[PDB]
Design a protein around this nucleic acid. Structure first.
Lengths: 219, 116, 120, 42
RNA sequence: GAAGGUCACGGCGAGACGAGCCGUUAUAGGUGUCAAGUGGAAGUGCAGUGAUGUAUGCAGCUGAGGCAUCCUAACAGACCCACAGACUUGAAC
RNA sequence: UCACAUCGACGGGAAGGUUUGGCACCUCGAUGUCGGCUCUUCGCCACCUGGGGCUGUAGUAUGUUCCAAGGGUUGGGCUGUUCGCCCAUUAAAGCGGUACGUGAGCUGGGUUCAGAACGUCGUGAGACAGUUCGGUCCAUAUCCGGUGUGGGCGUUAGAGCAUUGAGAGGACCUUUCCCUAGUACGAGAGGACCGGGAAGGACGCACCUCUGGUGUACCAGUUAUCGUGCCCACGGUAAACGCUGGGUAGCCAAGUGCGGAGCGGAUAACUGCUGAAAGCAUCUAAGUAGUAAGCCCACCCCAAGAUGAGUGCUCUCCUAU
RNA sequence: ACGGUCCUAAGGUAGCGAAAUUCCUUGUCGGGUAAGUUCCGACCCGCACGAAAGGCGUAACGAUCUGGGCACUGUCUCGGAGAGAGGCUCGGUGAAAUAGACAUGUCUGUGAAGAUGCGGACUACCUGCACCUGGACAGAAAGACCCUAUGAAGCUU
RNA sequence: ACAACUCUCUCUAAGGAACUCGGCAAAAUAGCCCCGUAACUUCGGGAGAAGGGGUGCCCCCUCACAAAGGGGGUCGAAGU
RNA sequence: AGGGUGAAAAGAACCCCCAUCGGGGAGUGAAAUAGAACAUGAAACCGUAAGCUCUCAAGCAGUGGGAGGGGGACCAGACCC
């Protein structure tokens, strides 16, 4: 919950092979940005029950928004945007609304960033692919191949246990990949270069916020 | 799981898919308007448009390229002569999909395809 | 990618002609051993009059593999053969000569192997 | 494999009525198209 | 016909169906082009009795990817929904 | 030397319900018998991993036994086999319950049909938990139960956004190496405690830049024959690529990234401080400190159908419309 | 190998032998394999081989049984991708076995000793669709085992 | 339409029986010509034993070897 | 296995929907709430309409108590859902 800095919204833009003057070949994700990461609302212990900052992203023609959202953004005096996401912090002040978040100035390279985002959707999938089950024999006359085998025990339990692993919808869900190196911040292009992989195909939103180690948070 | 895979199957194998698209393309070219299903129509826009595009550069090579397709010599000779006059202006998109009432004996959705 | 029951050529002149792998050593519950790793092998054939007779369980270390090991450079390296060198116990091989070609990754743990190599 | 008892009544009504509601939805959609049929469409 | 919602219409890295999300004057397709794949077309010239080679030519054919452009289809339109919010106490201009 | 480090005779007393029994209480108008595969879960009487007391504990490595069930507990040869022995490993190769878990999930090698044979018993037909070869394993899920996913309604005027966290899950695993230090210890031989670095293993989460598999979409060669009037050049067929050789996107791993962290809390065995009852002693009766992969917060995902229906921001309340 | 003594019609000759015979038993020894309750050769303690219910050998032949090798591979490590036919959705037609009544939760306790229905707790809006089979001592065939009936029927002396 | 799952199929990096009651299933072999062919044997066999080499397309020597035989060229990763 | 329109075929001219089937008016008849699938027409089973009533529930479904609501063209401390 309580995040170790203010995060920043972002967009995935494929993978690059990034070299260095050693000759270490490094795999990297190009992360682009679209109008803003503008602060919208500030929540407090005073009125709202907790400390937090809401941050929009991605500009629109202001017909595609609804009256209520138009009001909520026009109260802050802000460009039309989707994707208001919160960041619950302990720190509260110096986040007054209509203030742009300089991704360039707020990270500073070699940081190890924690990126969330919704993953690739693999539909309704079987026990094997979903829960890393094994399959039965192929020959020696086995009419079982890919299946769950037995489910439960016998008359004693007399029913199927709750959260028994079964075929279901794998993918299309949020997963924080945490601790990831920032390789380069292109001043020119406004494009962050992060080591490794990141959830979803090119297009997805990403909640880009700093390392959340247990010497940083709340004992 | 069909992620970023774009191909109109038409319920068939590759035997018969190309056989369909070919014959439909021929008949459409001949008559100029046909009635078929939505899927059989909507899939057909890659091949009619490809062949009209092929009829722009009327050369020995391109006529054989097209003539492998149509399986009716005398339609493809109608093109090459016809096309560059009555499509010279138009830059792509030579095909309109009007859409009309399900087929009786299977509630199959239905459409018209014809040259624009 | 050498595993239990894999047949492995010998790259030195300790006498053994061909091996067969029967276990990986070091890092337990390992599926298979790639270049650098030590294995256990039975000798399946040898030249007649050498010390190392047939049908003896002995250690080897894998040096040629058909399954591209990778540098940090980005360069990858296949071979056309799966072949190991018959280690003695800790240090050197039994023979005082190694054949073929072998990688730099080997020289950290096996200094004496890349000493005797022809074309590293 | 096999049913233990019959559903008998009331439950079968509940099951059938949703199926008839499928019909209802189709009726709404077909009603909507009749207005589209009247005027324009180019 | 409120706000909004649901349909329809073009779709999707979303999806068994519903659901989700984007689009409805840059959403899909087409066209133009460019990464990329494959490997040097057809036609003609020349060489050889001929199988064949060879030049025109990183060609020709693809192009599920990116980018450009309204050429085509996003037309036509439908359905649902509003009493400023029962009732009791106590602080407050 | 000394019963009580470690064993413990003759004898005595318990629990457990995994073995072999005794009984014949449910089931003969049927509840499928072993072993294997798949997938569980739970118990502790703890194989290893955490933390201890004693030692006939110099150290290393033990023995013994207390706390602890969070995690883990290999790959083969032989046998139908569970069991067992053996080979190569390893931190270790724990033992049990769940109809000796699981056949409307699978298998049919064993065992309970008919054939046939060997030994044997039988005057004979036939027989023998003696042996041998051969011998048909059903099923479209009504309900509960589960994994997913909608719709309705509810939440007190109706909505669009943002979240709070009751609650609930996933994950907290282990290996050698290096420094400490050849230090402490030890005559030598050997060789630490404590803490800090190392590259792995298994395991999970995500991705396709690299390496590739596939890629009946695409490109290339080539057999047979048919069609395009003929040569040239294409097309069809050779199941649901004729056969090969390549392969973008997608999807995949053998490929790439990431993960396991806390000087946070209360404890278990244990070690204590102060301290009587009992002028002394005593970890306890008052009080209090250290102190575990165990327990609770923290990490990560879900989550107000949390009817206890929370909280915030914002929008809307005209009429036949 | 050599003798003594009893019984009997006579006491197994050749050959073969741990075998389709071997209980004890994975006999022991050697070969084959890193490791071999199966396999090959030898031993003989033949429970209980044996001379036409033949004995022992044998080239060939076997959809014969039983061991080992080479080649070969998704059999497996350890899965992955793709094509068809289904499955899924829409329209048309439209069955079945089953069924005391069904307003048909989990835990532990209870009871014809193994409960959706009885006791105490816990959990849980109402209702579809897709998938899965642990339970309803699920369905199927008045158990084919076991035993009973002064039942039936075959076959033997 | 292009979910799981089942079937009928196609391919698969490294390994190559580690599967399993058992190589069950799949794979591999394959036509023709030439060379070559062991133990044993009832002297008929074993035997297609095993194992090797050549095959496409074009052009040539021959008062008679069913694209022969032999010689020379040419294409493909690959010629039944 | 499969009988019962009516006393009498008087078995429905004509009109409307309409290719047929069948249907509604007309006409016949004591009756067509006797129309040929025709006489009396029970139950299961399938609906349509009205009164009340379920979406924090747990239930062999009743029973004793009975909140709130509804009646029957007949004024009840009565009676019924």
């Amino acid at each position: 919950s309580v995040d170790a800095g203010i995060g920043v919204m972002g967009t995935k833009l494929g993978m690059m092979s990034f070299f260095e003057e050693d000759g270490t070949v490094v795999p990297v994700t190009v992360i682009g940005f679209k109008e803003g990461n503008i602060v919208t609302q500030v929540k407090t212990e005073s009125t709202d029950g907790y400390n937090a900052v809401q941050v929009g992203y991605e500009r629109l023609r202001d017909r595609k928004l609804t009256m209520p959202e138009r009001g909520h953004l026009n109260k802050a005096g802000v460009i039309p945007m989707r994707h208001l996401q919160e960041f619950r912090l302990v720190s509260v002040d110096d986040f007054t609304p209509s203030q742009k978040l300089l991704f360039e100035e707020l990270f500073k390279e070699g940081d190890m960033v924690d990126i969330s985002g919704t993953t690739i959707g693999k539909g309704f999938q079987g026990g094997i692919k979903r829960h890393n089950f094994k399959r039965g024999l192929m020959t020696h006359g086995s009419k079982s191949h890919r299946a769950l085998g037995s489910i439960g025990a016998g008359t004693t339990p007399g029913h199927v246990y709750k959260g028994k692993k079964m075929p279901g919808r794998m993918g299309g869900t949020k997963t924080k990949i945490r601790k990831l190196k920032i390789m380069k911040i292109d001043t020119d292009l406004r494009v962050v270069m992060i080591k490794g992989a990141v959830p979803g195909k090119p297009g997805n939103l990403l909640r880009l916020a700093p390392a959340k180690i247990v010497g940083k948070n709340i004992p | 799981m069909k992620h970023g895979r774009k191909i109109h199957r038409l319920s068939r194998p590759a035997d018969q898919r190309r056989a369909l698209l070919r014959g439909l393309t021929t008949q459409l070219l001949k008559h100029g308007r046909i009635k078929t299903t939505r899927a059989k129509a909507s899939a057909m826009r890659k091949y009619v448009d490809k062949m009209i595009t092929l009829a722009k550069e009327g050369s020995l090579h391109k006529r054989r390229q097209a003539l492998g397709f149509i399986y009716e010599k005398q339609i493809v000779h109608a093109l090459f002569a016809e096309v560059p006059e009555r499509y010279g202006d138009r830059n792509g998109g030579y095909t309109r999909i009007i859409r009309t009432l399900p087929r009786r004996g299977d509630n199959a959705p239905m459409a018209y395809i014809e040259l624009v | 990618m050498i595993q239990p029951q894999t047949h492995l050529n010998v790259a030195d002149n300790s006498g053994a002609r061909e091996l067969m792998c029967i276990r990986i050593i070091g890092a337990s519950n390992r599926r298979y051993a790639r270049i650098g790793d030590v294995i256990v092998a039975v000798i399946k054939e040898a030249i007649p009059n050498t010390p190392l007779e047939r049908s003896e369980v002995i250690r080897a270390v894998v040096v040629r593999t058909c399954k591209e090991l990778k540098r940090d450079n980005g360069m990858i390296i296949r071979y056309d053969d799966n072949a190991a060198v018959i280690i003695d116990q800790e240090g050197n091989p039994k023979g005082t000569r190694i054949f073929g070609a072998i990688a730099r990754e080997l020289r950290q743990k096996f200094a004496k192997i890349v000493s005797l190599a022809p074309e590293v | 494999a096999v049913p233990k008892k019959r559903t008998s009544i009331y439950k079968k009504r509940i099951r059938k009525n949703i199926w008839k509601k499928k019909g209802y939805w189709a009726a709404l959609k077909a009603f909507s198209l009749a207005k589209s049929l009247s005027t324009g469409n180019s």
